[PDB]
Write an enzyme that holds these catalytic residues in place. Structure first.
Site, short mmCIF file in Angstrom:
data_model
loop_
_atom_site.label_atom_id
_atom_site.label_comp_id
_atom_site.label_asym_id
_atom_site.label_seq_id
_atom_site.Cartn_x
_atom_site.Cartn_y
_atom_site.Cartn_z
N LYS A 1 -14.60 -8.73 -0.96
CA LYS A 1 -14.74 -9.14 0.44
C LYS A 1 -16.20 -8.91 0.83
CE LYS A 1 -12.53 -8.87 4.99
NZ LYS A 1 -11.65 -8.05 5.88
N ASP B 1 -1.63 -12.86 1.34
CA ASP B 1 -2.20 -11.77 2.11
C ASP B 1 -2.60 -12.42 3.42
OD1 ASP B 1 -3.31 -9.50 3.12
OD2 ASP B 1 -4.93 -9.40 1.65
N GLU C 1 -9.42 -13.60 -2.82
CA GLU C 1 -8.68 -14.07 -1.65
C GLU C 1 -9.39 -15.29 -1.08
OE1 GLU C 1 -7.21 -11.31 1.40
OE2 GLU C 1 -8.12 -12.61 2.90
N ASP D 1 -7.06 -14.33 7.98
CA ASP D 1 -5.76 -14.19 7.28
C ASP D 1 -4.69 -15.11 7.86
OD1 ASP D 1 -7.00 -12.30 5.70
OD2 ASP D 1 -5.82 -10.60 6.39
N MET E 1 2.97 -5.92 -7.81
CA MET E 1 1.65 -5.40 -7.48
C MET E 1 1.75 -4.31 -6.43
SD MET E 1 -0.92 -5.49 -5.01
CE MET E 1 -0.96 -7.00 -4.02
N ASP F 1 -4.82 -13.84 -3.95
CA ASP F 1 -4.40 -13.73 -2.55
C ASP F 1 -4.59 -15.08 -1.88
OD1 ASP F 1 -3.73 -11.04 -2.78
OD2 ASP F 1 -5.25 -10.31 -1.41
N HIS G 1 0.86 -1.18 0.00
CA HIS G 1 0.00 0.00 0.00
C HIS G 1 0.89 1.23 0.00
CE1 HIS G 1 -2.56 -3.01 2.07
NE2 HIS G 1 -3.56 -2.40 1.46
N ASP H 1 -12.33 -12.09 9.44
CA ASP H 1 -11.29 -12.33 8.43
C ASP H 1 -10.00 -12.72 9.15
OD1 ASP H 1 -10.01 -12.32 5.86
OD2 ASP H 1 -9.45 -10.23 6.13
N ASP I 1 2.03 1.93 3.48
CA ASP I 1 3.00 1.02 4.10
C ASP I 1 4.42 1.51 3.90
OD1 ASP I 1 0.94 -0.83 4.69
OD2 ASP I 1 1.23 -1.84 2.75
N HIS J 1 -11.74 -14.64 1.91
CA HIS J 1 -12.89 -13.77 1.70
C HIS J 1 -14.07 -14.52 1.10
CE1 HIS J 1 -10.21 -9.91 1.87
NE2 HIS J 1 -10.20 -10.62 2.99
N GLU K 1 -10.35 -6.70 -5.53
CA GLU K 1 -10.30 -7.69 -4.48
C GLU K 1 -11.63 -7.70 -3.74
OE1 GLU K 1 -6.92 -7.50 -1.94
OE2 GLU K 1 -7.78 -8.89 -0.48
#
Ligand SMILES: [Mg+2]
Ligand SMILES: [Mg+2]
Ligand SMILES: [Mg+2]
Ligand SMILES: [Mg+2]
Ligand SMILES: [Mn+2]
Ligand SMILES: [Mn+2]
Ligand SMILES: [Mn+2]
Ligand SMILES: [Mn+2]
Lengths: 387, 387, 387, 387
Positions: free
Chosen positions: B182, B286, B216, B256, B87, B244, B53, B254, B56, B219, B180
């Protein structure tokens, strides 16, 4: 003051009030209904029309001579009552030959039979005046990962629907197709499991204008999804051809409760949307009177479907007409959501320093959305506590 | 014998191994990681690349001079290691200004800011060599029914993505977009909640060829859906641009988890599909190392992602190569599913009496599908019990 | 109408209206509230009292003298307003030391610290007048199967609650304990995940009479369970010491919406049960004003909690008072359900030929239960459509 | 390897391999099996024994003399094969008279009939050597909130089980009862929906020592619960009398897949728990061969149940025997979880300054739990990737 009439476009499947109550753990609790009796009783309750599977009206295996007799008595009850047949569908799930699917069975000969069975009933549906032909692929799917190559299965599904579209085009029939999604049951996972998947699939058909969706309240809710949001996407795409109304308490087996039962606030927002958007199609109830009920309970359940829609329609209209709600919607900036983000265009947006270089992000972050006041006004209207 | 190398195309987000462990009920349990440290440690583990991101890599609010310094140290770690950046994405969910969304916020000025923030990071992503630009609309949605007119929201979402496509086209950038999906969290319901909904939305964009999906594992499983089936539909549509990988134990928050955890058989069938279909994109994780773990546990978790993929790839290949499985697939008529239903055409099908008038439905119904033998062979291969 | 007053016994946690809006994907959207401000604002809205975690009142790490200062201010606000403190609890989940649990952390020294932290706040709770001490073991659990031996963890959980019971009995405190169940989040699976598991666990404590449950609407619904049914079982066992009211839309992350939102019909049947059973404890709202809201929205959400309870209470009273409903309850044989099955005893039942040898099972099977008429009467009462 | 033998204690219900494949949307795909054939086929596969509902063995409505005839044939097949009958149960759910329940039907005469039907089959079960009598109250429950007063229903449920306990004690039968919980289906909500609710209910029976639970893998997973954790709580309470093994893919209809399918890692941790705790009761498979299968597939599915248990048993034994795993269990402090928290007692804990005043919470907080390394070791063992 909630009496249904044919102008409300309420319809019922023969298989709904006719459900005998056999469930996966139990025998039938009610006798079978004569289709002619259901037509007459539903007319008396104020319904606008009925729908049917081929096998609801014509017992599987009937000769063409028997077939004609069943169709003749049925048409004679329709003519006597003024009842309409706005939708028909095929049963590609009950007979054991369909245990691995109809259009996507691994055996090629079963796929050819499924198509022939469907085409035969399209002829009948157009004859009786149906505008929509529904497909619920209840057996298209798998319990295990190796049993179905899903890319090949989708090739076969596309092939089947393309052929159906070629058939109705060459016959010059005025009828459209609607895919009814369901995520699971009776298969472990069903192909095209949601409104979204079905909408995406349609865009790869040879004649996408012929196909839309028939979403069902309970089916999207079996995936935990927001049914009004999914209906809004279908309306936005121009694809809401039909709709199945009923009730479901969350993620579990397909309950098919009467409309209004299950998730009550979701039903309120669904009705608000359909009425605000001007949906003009049938309000169809794909529901099952619980097997605890005798035949009086069957007709009470059906009448309750229609009643709950009319109560919710009145509350939704009152909500939208209330000037205090109109002001709350402005306070939550629902009107700004209708405004283009950047109708000045990309170049202007990139040059606009107030959109980034000089944007006061913290002032914008401090603005409350006032969503809770709006939602409590919606509560009060639903409960009839405005006064 | 499961050592990852860059040829395996394993990638990780900076926010994954960098997750400090703040959850809705708890404070951080780990210090922040320097992006440069993550690049170097991931290179040593055999990763092919990193993703990010904007926020980030560049702390929110940085001056353009600070921005350049952060980008410079990062590029110097990329050049030193040979690590790729396949990406990038935008953070349109953490800052309070995005509490009602970015592209579909009710406030128009926030939508314009979200677009400017995104475009700025597209420039950076192309500079660093990203091939895919991901959008996760984590804040696009609602907790209550009146807060969001979803048809207007989808107009705004389409407007945003159309403008992004106009921008990259006019700049001549070789980059594609991946949505993406969700279904929920952090909003009560998120717009475009599944792979299907996202695929359907793309078909209404002005330049649909520019857009695909980044599904993902966890998700789709939060909606109870079959992730390999959804991936198969995305591949069938030509839209699997990125993926993902992680783990999820069913319908809940979620999680992960690291890949392989959660639903193990679903992971086996996912790998079988990606490898059999020749998916050539990044295998991106992810995931979030659980907050119980110190930094050794963080790198063990990341290494475990890659290890589990390689174990499953070997088992999937052995399954497909086993002549006994090849025979089981024939016994279950997987080869017949690949055959056109009616390449002789509609007229021939309608004239074919063996497809209906003379079809032995009961003989066809008596054929077992032999799916349980096939699935136990798949079990034995996954467990390494063939011998 | 629907104005709350202190006799309605509505209570709120400091952490509810005080929630700053930080969630797993976003920063705080609201500033922190002074606990003295929350007491005064809640008194103005008509609340009966407030509840607190130790860490809501006294910042973690405070010296004994800083502690007394914060307690002093709080008690002053209580004395000035007449506001009660009916319940208190311990925060054993926010600080990183509790990342593997408090009472069931694998590390023995953390478990001892957890017990000391709790005991210190029990003394404070008794001073302020609390009659119930709530335990939510939000960190007791695991993400992976090997991380926790659940038999040993239940031994540690029983040990902790046994020690707490020994402490309060040795001090002569008038205070009872209530366990708050939750199935998951923030741990992948939480121990004692539902009302039932907690009730079973209490029966193995040394002094079971000291312990009951504090069920929460949204938590049981996160397992797809029927919350009124669970509350009925807790009342049947004499263990409903306290209750947490809020709203939740099905199986997903813990939403903590205001009461009445989420599942509205379940809220109606819950209020019907509590009022008809004569539950006389606090009506406590464990909810989070959505982070979209400013402080005006925070107080509107809190007021909506209380409003919705009062509306539902009125509708359920009208339902039960309706002679037509009383007649429908008799038609569905609710009164026969309260008749003992065999008060004539085992021997009489065995000799009664009308109970088997001469029982007309087909005539019994044909009786309709009339549940759909009864439920539509309940629907009409909820919606204010009677009259 | 992995050949089952009678010492493995694998058992199957007559209704499992005998399932004809009728589901809510389809007709039977398989002919009915003679119970004598099922006994002999299961013996050939290496099963230990069979279980039955009364109605599986003796067609409903049979005269006393027809009854004895069916029992005669069955007992002959048992004597010829050495096959055991460790468990029996009553069908209180298929016949329409039970549409509102058996023990908790609103109609008093149905409840009395339910008790007589059950008592008759207890006598038969004891004759055939059953040590456990299972009750699955599949019809005890409701679709709507007014249809059942759950407090009165729990009174009726307790009355029924109290009468059953009085019957077996007055006869001197060596037989214990086990309640099989299920959250939903075929009723909208079923009473005693989980292991926890059933354990709590047992503690209110007059003779609690006579009653335990018969948990089923898929049923707890239908509420999204962790099945190994629930089994651990049942073992901790001394109440695991029997167990039902099968597979289930998350929250949806009751799938009853063969054991090992569904959630594979949960199956691994379940087998690890049962074997390490020394559970010595039947390993009973309550499963349904999918209706896609012919009779060859039926026996392949049954054999797969047993095979998957034996493979998982081998992998869990290897996991626990691995010195490297023993070292990782110590690194994660599983051994400290078995240490009492405060065997020095309440007074010593209160005076221990290292437990609070001088506890270094920051140093404690920084310790990693090393759970991810431990879980990847478990993953490697499951997949056969150790060595
Ligand atoms: Mg339908
Ligand atoms: Mg992701
Ligand atoms: Mg709570
Ligand atoms: Mg069972
Ligand atoms: Mn349905
Ligand atoms: Mn995720
Ligand atoms: Mn909660
Ligand atoms: Mn089951």
């Amino acid at each position: 003051n909630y009496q249904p009439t044919p102008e409300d476009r309420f319809t019922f499947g023969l298989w709904t009030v006719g459900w005998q109550g056999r469930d996966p753990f139990g025998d039938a609790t009610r006798r079978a209904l004569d289709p002619v009796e259901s037509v007459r009783r539903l007319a008396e309750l104020g319904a606008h029309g009925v729908t049917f599977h081929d096998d609801d009206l014509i017992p599987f295996g009937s000769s063409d001579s028997e077939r004609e007799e069943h169709v003749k008595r049925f048409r004679q009850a329709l003519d006597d009552t003024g009842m309409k047949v706005p939708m028909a569908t095929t049963n590609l799930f009950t007979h054991p030959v369909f245990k691995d699917g109809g259009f996507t069975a691994n055996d090629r000969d079963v796929r050819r039979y499924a198509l022939r069975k469907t085409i035969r009933n399209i002829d009948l549906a157009v004859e009786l005046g149906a505008e929509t032909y529904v497909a619920w692929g209840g057996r298209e799917g798998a319990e295990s990962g190796g049993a179905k190559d899903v890319r090949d299965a989708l090739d076969r599904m596309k092939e089947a629907f393309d052929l159906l579209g070629e058939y109705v085009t060459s016959q010059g029939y005025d009828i459209r197709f609607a895919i009814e999604p369901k995520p699971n049951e009776p298969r472990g996972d069903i192909l095209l499991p949601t409104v979204g998947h079905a909408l995406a699939f349609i865009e790869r058909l040879e004649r996408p204008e012929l196909y839309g969706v028939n979403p069902e309240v309970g089916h999207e809710q079996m995936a935990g999804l927001n049914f009004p949001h999914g209906i809004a996407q279908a309306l936005w795409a121009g694809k809401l051809f039909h709709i199945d109304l009923n009730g479901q308490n969350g993620i579990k087996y397909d309950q098919d409760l009467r409309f209004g039962a299950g998730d009550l606030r979701a039903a309120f927002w669904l009705v608000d949307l359909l009425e605000s958007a001007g949906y003009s199609g049938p309000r169809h109830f794909d529901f099952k009177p619980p097997r605890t009920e005798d035949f009086d309970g069957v007709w009470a359940s059906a009448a309750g479907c229609m009643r709950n829609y009319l109560i919710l329609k009145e509350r939704a209209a009152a909500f939208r007409a209330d000037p205090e709600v109109q002001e709350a919607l402005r306070a939550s900036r629902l009107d700004e959501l209708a405004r283009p983000t950047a109708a000045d265009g990309l170049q202007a947006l990139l040059d606009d320093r107030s959109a980034f270089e000089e944007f006061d992000v913290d002032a914008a972050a401090a603005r409350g959305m006032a969503f809770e006041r709006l939602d409590q006004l919606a509560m009060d209207h639903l409960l009839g506590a405005r006064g």
